[PDB]
Each structure stands twice: as C-alpha cells, then as structure tokens.
Design a binder for this molecule. Structure first.
Ligand SMILES: Cc1ccc(-c2noc(CNC(C)C)n2)cc1
Ligand SMILES: Cc1ccc(-c2noc(CNC(C)C)n2)cc1
Ligand SMILES: [Zn+2]
Ligand SMILES: [Zn+2]
Ligand SMILES: [Zn+2]
Ligand SMILES: [Zn+2]
Lengths: 359, 359
C-alpha cells in the first residue's frame, strides 16, 4: 500500500473514532459533531503533510531492514500514521491559535478558522484547545499497550512546551527584554540590539524545529522501537539545523514571493518580525542604512514597508543567503555522515527530509 | 505541618523548578523568566484553592488510617500538593482563555490577564497554553517513577478534554443546534427550545464538574494509591451532583449578588446564558411571561436586562432553588452513604467537600 493512501485512510478512521467517542461518551449531539468534523477537516487537511508523513517514511525505512511478521509491519505502519496525525493536529492547534493571536487573515489561500462566519474567536480559541486534546485521545487509545507509550507522551509533551516557549520568544521578539513588564504596554525596540543571529536562532529553534523536525524523526524511531539505531544528540543537532534553514527560507518568502504562492499576504516587516532578512541586513548595513531601517520598520504604511524592501534588495541579501546555504549544506551532510555510523536507513530518511526542505 | 502552609510552600518550589528548568534547558533570559513568574502568580494565586486543597485533604484522610513510614507520609503529602497545583494551573489555563473568549473585564476583582497593559491577547492566548503545559512538566518531573503516573496522566487528559467539550457546549448554548454551521454566522435562539434541564445539566457536567469535583477527588485517591477503597461509579455520580449544585449557585449569584462580592459584573442575561434561572423560569412561566422573556433576553440594553430580572423575581425562583437544594441534599447524603461501605475516610472527605460547597 502507498504511504499517502495509508496516511489519509488513517485520518478517516481517527476522525470516525474521535466523533464516535464524543457521541458514546461525551453526550454529543449530531449538529455539534458535524461542527467539530468540519473544524477538524478545515484545520488539519489541505497541507502537504510533511511532518506526518515523515513519521511514516522513517518507519517504512526501518521496515526494509528489520525482520517482522506481516501483521507487525501493518501495526507499525498504522502506529506511524496515528503518530503522524498527532503531529498534524498539534500543528493545527498552533496554527489556529497563532492566527487568532496575530490577527491573521488567510491561511493556505483560505480564511483563518476564526474568521469563518459561524466560528468566531470565542469558539476558535477553544476549537484550537480541542485539536491538541485530540492528539492525546489518539495516543491513549491507539497506543494503550504499546511499550513506547510513555516515551512518546513524554517527547510529545516536551516538544509542545518548547513550541509554546518558542511562540513566546516570537511574540516578544520586537520588544526590549529589559522593558517586558505585564503592567506596562510594550513599545517596539528602538535600537534593534536584540536582532542578532543568536537571538533569531533561539526563536526558530523553539518555535519551529522541535515540532517540525525533531518530533517527526524521533516519533518515527519510537513507533519503530529503533531509538537505539541512533545517537540522540546527533538527531537533535541535525533537526535544529534543517529546522533553522526552513525558517530562513519562509522568512525570505514572507518578503519576496507573491501572496498567491505564499497562501498568505506577508506582514513580517509591519509586525516588526525578527526575520533572517532584518538580522542579516543589520549585520552588514552602514550607519545611514541602519537609521533608515529604524525609521520604516514595523509600520503598516505601505510606503515605509517598500523602503524596508528597498534596503534589503540593495544590501545584497541573496549573497548572504547562498553563503548561509552552502554552510548549512556542509553541516547537514557532516551530520548525515555521523548518522550513517549507527543507521544508514535513518541517515537516508534524514537525507530525504533535508532534500524536501532544500527543494 | 498545616495543610495550607504545605500547599503554598510547594507552589514556591514548583515555580522555582519550572523557572530554573526554563533557564537551564530552554535558553530563557531573566526578563522573560520574570514575565512568566508574574504570569504564573497573577493567574494561579489569589483564589481559595478549593480544588488543589481537596487533593491534599483526601490524601490527609487516608494517612490517618494507613500505616506508613514518616518519609512516605511526606512523599504522599508532597505528591498531593503537586497534584493539587496541577489542577489549579489547569483551572488557570481555562480562566485565562475563557476570559479572552468572552471578552471578560474582571476576574477576582482584578483585570483579566489579557487586559494587563504589557500582556495583550496576542501573548495571553499563549500564556494560557503555557499554563496547561506546566501541569504536564510538573507531573513528568515530580511523579517520574510513581506507580500512579500513567493513571494520573490518563485521568488528567480525560478531564481536560471533557472541560474543553464542556466549554464548547457552553459557548454554543444560545444557538439552535440545527443551525450550527461554520459557514453561517450564528443567530441567538428565538424559541429557547434547548433551554432544558437536561441540556443545562450537560453543559455544567462537562464544563465544571469534571475539573472542579471529579479530578481533585480521584487525584487524591491516585496519590494515596487508594483507588480500591472506592467504587469509581459512585465517586463519579457524587461529583457530578455536587458539581451541578455548585453551578446552580453561581448561576444564581451571576444575577443576584452585587459585583463587589462576585468579583465580576455578571453578564449571563446579556450573553444569553443557559443558566439555571432561565431554564427553571421557562419550566414554570405562562405564555405572556415566555414572550416577555424572549423580547428582552441576550441584550445589553440595561432596561431589557432589568426586565429579565423582574420576571425571575416575580416567578419565585427561590422556591424552586430550595426544592432543588432539598433534593440535592437527599441524593448527596445517599451517595455518601453508599461511599461509607468501602471507605469512611473517603466518604468523610466527600462530606467535607459538599459542606464547603453548600455553605
Ligand atoms: C519533516 C519535514 C518538515 C517540513 C518539511 C518541509 N516544509 O516545507 C517543505 C517544502 N517547501 C519548499 C517547496 C519551498 N518541506 C519537510 C520535512
Ligand atoms: C472540590 C471543591 C471544589 C469547589 C468548592 C467550592 N467552590 O466554591 C465554594 C465556596 N462557595 C461559597 C462560599 C458560596 N466551594 C469546594 C470543593
Ligand atoms: Zn505568530
Ligand atoms: Zn513566516
Ligand atoms: Zn465562558
Ligand atoms: Zn457564571
């Protein structure tokens, strides 16, 4: 059976299971069941399933090199699908809540969930909450007597928290740390002294890399009972690296990719985002350019936003990007190499992820 | 050591642990640490700790009748405190998010967390997320090799989901189920055909009773390894009952308790809440009263809200309340009785909860 076909089938099974359990154990009525079904489809379907499918692809890899009965192969593949869906639903949770937090308009060329006329922020905050509880209902039901249950839940829990800590670093990234105070409305930074590579790297690592890269790879290993074909410090380093690279590209596209293709009008300039472009720009600008940057950044006035774009184009950031890219390629290949010692299968799955990321 | 003193001490220890782990493992900086410390104190302290302290009080009960070394007594009491705090933090999560959802103004005579000038909805949604992840960080750290870890996490997870399902029943309680549709803005009900005792009881059971009553009692039993001194169906029924009673009283106070004492201006009338008062009023009104109810309910126009209050006063709802109260007292005492078979200690703790609730 092809992997996508399995993964999509498992969605319909898990949806049926969750909705049926609401009826049999939570006294739900059909109209509310239908609301949550539509919620689930609208927030969880329609992407490329990179994160979910990685869990499946990692598991498929170990299946080729490990002796198993047929029924075990199926159980492993089914576990990989459910685990994959746990990450997609985790992602959907974060996307629903982030869009509300940020006052976002569109997501995947369609309106954000909270904007749907019969949803509203009042319901959508809680719909996002339910998405994440669904990930745990899946794990407890499907993996009830799996040996990996404890480790899986512990990992998931750590990644979730990292993500939320990351979101916090992200939403406060235009503030001066020394001014943060729940009592005092927060001004945007004037100096941009916290627009550094290290500070940037901290936001992306917590906000994105743990749930996008670390979680699917390690979940793959857990459902395959293969945590011992790898050096966990290595899997960490390579994920944080591929993950960083991922965010550099979406920081670049937020700026220089028409809103048609982005599936979203970019507002990193006007949100005064600590993006790779602003940081890298500030690491190479002369004094007159830094002053012009500061006079325009974080302003919706389209004219000021077109000034920030001008400065980035002028400053030749594509050269910095290709330099970054060359170094990331170096480091990723070296890490892949170090992964091949213990597992060529796992190293090949990390190679396949990095490819999809790069292209 | 007195129980409150222990419980508050354990707060300072758990706060220190969580903040220290952010620094040592999540690369946090001191100013963000201070933000989250203030967040934690402002959202989690200041209440009566009924839910948290019940876990402690249940555990104290079994300590009197069970042979244990001193070090075990302390470990059990310490576990009860941490578990208690897991419920307070769960509650804080729900209060932070509900206040945002509902556009609430005050909570405990102080502004809702999201209203604080240096917070904003953008941060407060995520602060609420962190509150709930903190409950899991506590459990995994403090209860890492406890035999009850699995059961505790499973229970907590079920209660959390129930609560979120409950919130959903609550936020959609003024809609007609047959009209719910994420595509179509939701009108308030015209007929009030879903303002029934059964429908009311469904909202309160999911929204409140699981986290407020079931969770503290069962968590008490789990940390005491005493799940076998009770009949779990009984503990369920008595909690759902005391819990329902709880909501009937706060539905009454939302209306007839000055905002000074409530710690919050009530808006159940103008939110068109399925409260006990509206339901009970509709179960006894004549046709002219139902029509007047319908012409005023769910409207901020204070004059219309004063009409709804008039109708409730006229309709003699206090008599219905005392009738309800007499029946709840009957049923609770009968359940206590059925609990005494297996455990007089547990039955006495359920007696102590019901007292605090009643008074
Ligand atoms: C585990 C994992 C996670 C994310 C990705 C990924 N995300 O976006 C892309 C493709 N973005 C190109 C088309 C610009 N690949 C791949 C693997
Ligand atoms: C386990 C648990 C949970 C809640 C309560 C409770 N809540 O509020 C009150 C007191 N409300 C009176 C002063 C009107 N008792 C008690 C025990
Ligand atoms: Zn965001
Ligand atoms: Zn972006
Ligand atoms: Zn509410
Ligand atoms: Zn209320």
């Amino acid at each position: 059976m092809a992997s996508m076909e399995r993964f999509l089938s498992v969605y319909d099974e898990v949806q049926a299971f969750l909705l049926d359990q609401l009826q049999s154990k939570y006294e739900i009525d059909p109209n509310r069941a239908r609301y949550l079904r539509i919620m689930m489809d609208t927030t969880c379907l329609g992407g490329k399933y990179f994160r979910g499918m990685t869990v499946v692809n990692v598991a498929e890899g170990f299946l080729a090199v490990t002796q198993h009965d047929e029924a075990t192969k199926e159980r492993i593949l089914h576990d990989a699908c459910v685990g994959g869906w746990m990450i997609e639903f985790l992602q959907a949770h974060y996307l629903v809540e982030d869009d509300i937090m940020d006052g976002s308009v569109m997501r995947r060329g369609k309106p954000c969930w909270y904007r749907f006329p019969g949803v509203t922020t009042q319901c959508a905050i809680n719909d996002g909450i339910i998405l994440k509880s669904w990930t745990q209902i899946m794990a407890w039901h499907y993996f009830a007597d799996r040996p990996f249950l404890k480790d899986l839940l512990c990992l998931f829990q750590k990644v979730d928290y990292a993500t939320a800590v990351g979101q916090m670093y992200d939403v406060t990234s235009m503030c001066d740390s020394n001014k943060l105070d729940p009592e005092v409305a927060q001004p945007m930074t004037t100096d941009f002294a916290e627009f550094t590579p290290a500070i940037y790297k901290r936001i992306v690592k917590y906000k994105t890399t743990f749930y996008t890269y670390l979680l699917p790879l390690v979940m793959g290993l857990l459902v395959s009972e293969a945590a011992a074909s790898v050096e966990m410090n290595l899997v960490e380093r390579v994920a944080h690296l591929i993950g960083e690279y991922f965010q550099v590209q979406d920081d670049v596209m937020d700026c220089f990719t028409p809103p048609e293709q982005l599936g979203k009008v970019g507002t990193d300039i006007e949100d005064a985002k600590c993006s790779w472009l602003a940081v890298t720009f500030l690491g190479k600008a002369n004094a007159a350019q830094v002053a012009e940057f500061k006079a325009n950044y974080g302003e919706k006035d389209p004219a000021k936003v077109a000034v920030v774009k001008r400065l980035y184009s002028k400053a030749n950031l594509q050269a910095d990007f290709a330099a970054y890219e060359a170094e990331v390629v170096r480091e990723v290949e070296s890490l892949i190499e170090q992964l091949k010692v213990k597992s060529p299968t796992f190293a090949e799955s990390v190679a396949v992820v990095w490819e999809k990321t790069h292209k």
